[PDB]
């Protein structure tokens, strides 16, 4: 895990790091899920495998959690399903907060931005509600959902800036590949 940037946004310490989110030292990590919480690939698969030892098992656990937390088999942008991090608890990660970003498919609009904005703010508000002090996020929608990485990072930063809370003290954005981390770093530098 390599930290590439650190700054304060109010009382929150914000970090950009390059690495695997399942190894980040945060109490909650966020999953870039689909609305059905079927963890087929990308960071959802990585998280599901790291937590349960089998992604399929974590998918079932997630669906059960969603059914009881929401009373249905899908979530809307901004809604957050919470599941225990299981095997990751030994490294201090207690929860996975599943969020669902929009499917951009190479496009960008205010409607897509608003959906992604909700997908980033929702987990921050859930952390606040639960009294969770540290949370880490992946670049929601920047993978197979095809949202431009720069736009994803700018949207994440807007959510962190607008968030109001007292319990959340540390937020991190964890980027996986080297090329992408460089793009994110430039966004952090020009935004702050």
Ligand X SMILES: Nc1ncnc2c1ncn2[C@@H]1O[C@H](COP(=O)(O)OP(=O)(O)OC[C@H]2O[C@H](O)[C@H](O)[C@@H]2O)[C@@H](O)[C@H]1O
Residues making up the annotated binding site for substrate are 19-21, 32-34, 39-44, 140-146
Beta carbons of 176 and 142 less than 8 angstroms apart: no
User: Rounded to an integer, what distance in angstroms lies between the CA atom of residue 158 and that of residue 135?
Assistant: 16
Sign of the Cα torsion 55, 58, 64, 67 reads: negative
Asked if 75 is part of the footprint of ligand X (rule: CB under 6 A), the reply reads no
Cβ at position 71, least distance to ligand X in Å:
22
Asked if 123 is part of the footprint of ligand X (rule: CB under 6 A), the reply reads no
User: Rounded to an integer, what distance in angstroms lies between the CA atom of residue 142 and that of residue 156?
Assistant: 11
Centre a 10 Å sphere on the Cβ of residue 118 and count the other Cβ atoms it contains.
21
Q: Which of 58, 66, 97, 101 binds ligand X (CB under 6 A)?
A: 101
Residue count at the site for ligand X (CB under 6 A)?
27
Q: Which of 4, 13, 20, 151 binds ligand X (CB under 6 A)?
A: 20
Asked if 55 is part of the footprint of ligand X (rule: CB under 6 A), the reply reads no
Residue showing tokens 């960071």: 43
Beta carbons of 124 and 165 less than 8 angstroms apart: yes
Asked if 107 is part of the footprint of ligand X (rule: CB under 6 A), the reply reads no
Asked if 21 is part of the footprint of ligand X (rule: CB under 6 A), the reply reads yes
Return the range that interacts with ligand X (CB under 6 A); candidates 70-78, 105-113, 138-146, 164-172: 138-146
Residue numbers of the site for ligand X (CB under 6 A)?
Answer: 20-22, 32-34, 38-44, 46, 101, 138-145, 174, 176-177, 180
């Amino acid at each position: 895990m390599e930290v590439l940037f650190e700054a304060k946004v109010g009382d929150i310490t914000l970090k950009l790091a390059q690495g695997d989110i399942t190894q980040y030292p945060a109490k909650a990590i966020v999953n870039a899920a689909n609305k059905r919480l079927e963890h087929g690939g990308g960071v959802a698969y990585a998280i599901a495998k790291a937590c349960a030892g089998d992604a399929g098992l974590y998918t079932e656990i997630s669906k059960k959690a969603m059914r009881e937390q929401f009373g249905r088999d899908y979530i809307d942008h901004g809604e957050v399903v919470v599941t225990p991090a299981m095997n990751l608890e030994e490294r201090g990660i207690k929860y996975v907060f599943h969020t669902v970003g929009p499917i951009c498919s190479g496009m960008w609009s205010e409607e897509l931005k608003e959906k992604l904005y909700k997908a980033f703010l929702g987990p921050l508000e859930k952390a606040e509600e639960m009294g969770v002090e540290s949370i880490a996020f992946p670049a929601v929608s920047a993978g197979i959902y095809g949202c431009d990485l720069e736009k994803v990072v700018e949207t994440f930063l807007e959510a962190v800036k607008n968030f109001k809370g007292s319990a959340v003290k540390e937020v991190a954005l964890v980027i996986y590949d080297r090329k992408s981390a460089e793009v994110a770093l430039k966004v952090f530098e020009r935004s702050l």
